[PDB]
């Protein structure tokens, strides 16, 4: 990330894990119109295998699996994610978001609201250029774990 994007990324990593997940969901909704949907052109993608392992879990454990991706760990799902390239890692998150929209991954609860104190960060992200937001995501997903 560049000089203008580093502060936003650093703030993001300082939120609690649940807040990070929610912000990633809201970020997806904001970016979605300008994103090409997953999967990529390759069929045997390693990202699909990691997503598929998460999809096969109960919804509650899908949530725990996504929490563990941000927190880090050495379990099977973390290891599958950690072996991926940064763009493949981002593919997993994109597949998860698409799964939330098609009903195969646990969705954002209708009663959830962000903890107080996210307004400044979301305002700052809204001011970033599209290229800066792409670099934010590539750097953020690689830094998880």
Ligand X SMILES: CC1=C(/C=C/C(C)=C/C=C/C(C)=C/C=C/C=C(C)/C=C/C=C(C)/C=C/C2=C(C)C(=O)CCC2(C)C)C(C)(C)CCC1=O
Interface segment toward ligand X; rule CB under 6 A; list 2-10, 28-36, 56-64, 69-77? 28-36
Establish whether the linkage from the previous residue to 145 is cis, with ω within 30° of 0.
Answer: no
Q: Which listed residue (3, 33, 36, 123) binds ligand X by CB under 6 A?
A: 36
Residue 35 interacts with ligand X (CB under 6 A): yes or no: yes
Residue 87 interacts with ligand X (CB under 6 A): yes or no: no
Provide the Cα torsion 11, 72, 93, 112; round to 10°: -60
* Residue 62 C-beta: closest distance to ligand X, Å: 24
Closest CA to 135 of 31, 18, 46, 29: 31
Token pair 């929490």 is found at 67
d(CA 54, CA 102): 15
Pick between residue 36 and residue 74 the one whose CB is nearest to ligand X. 36
Interface segment toward ligand X; rule CB under 6 A; list 11-19, 22-30, 31-39, 41-49? 31-39
Binding site for ligand X (CB under 6 A): 34-36
């Amino acid at each position: 990330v560049d000089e203008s994007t580093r502060p936003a990324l650093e703030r993001f990593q300082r939120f609690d894990v649940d807040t990070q997940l929610a912000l990633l969901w809201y970020g997806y909704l904001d970016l979605k119109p300008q994103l090409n949907p997953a999967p990529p052109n390759s069929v045997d993608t390693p990202a699909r295998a990691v997503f598929d392992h998460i999809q096969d879990l109960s919804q509650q454990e899908q949530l725990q699996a996504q929490r563990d991706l941000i927190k880090g760990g050495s379990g099977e799902i973390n290891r599958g994610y950690n072996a991926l390239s940064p763009n493949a890692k981002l593919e997993v998150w994109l597949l998860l978001a698409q799964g939330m929209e098609n009903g195969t991954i646990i969705p954002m609860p209708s009663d959830y609201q962000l903890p107080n104190g996210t307004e400044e960060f979301t305002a700052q992200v809204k001011k970033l250029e599209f290229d800066q937001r792409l670099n934010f995501m590539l750097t953020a997903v690689q830094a998880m774990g």
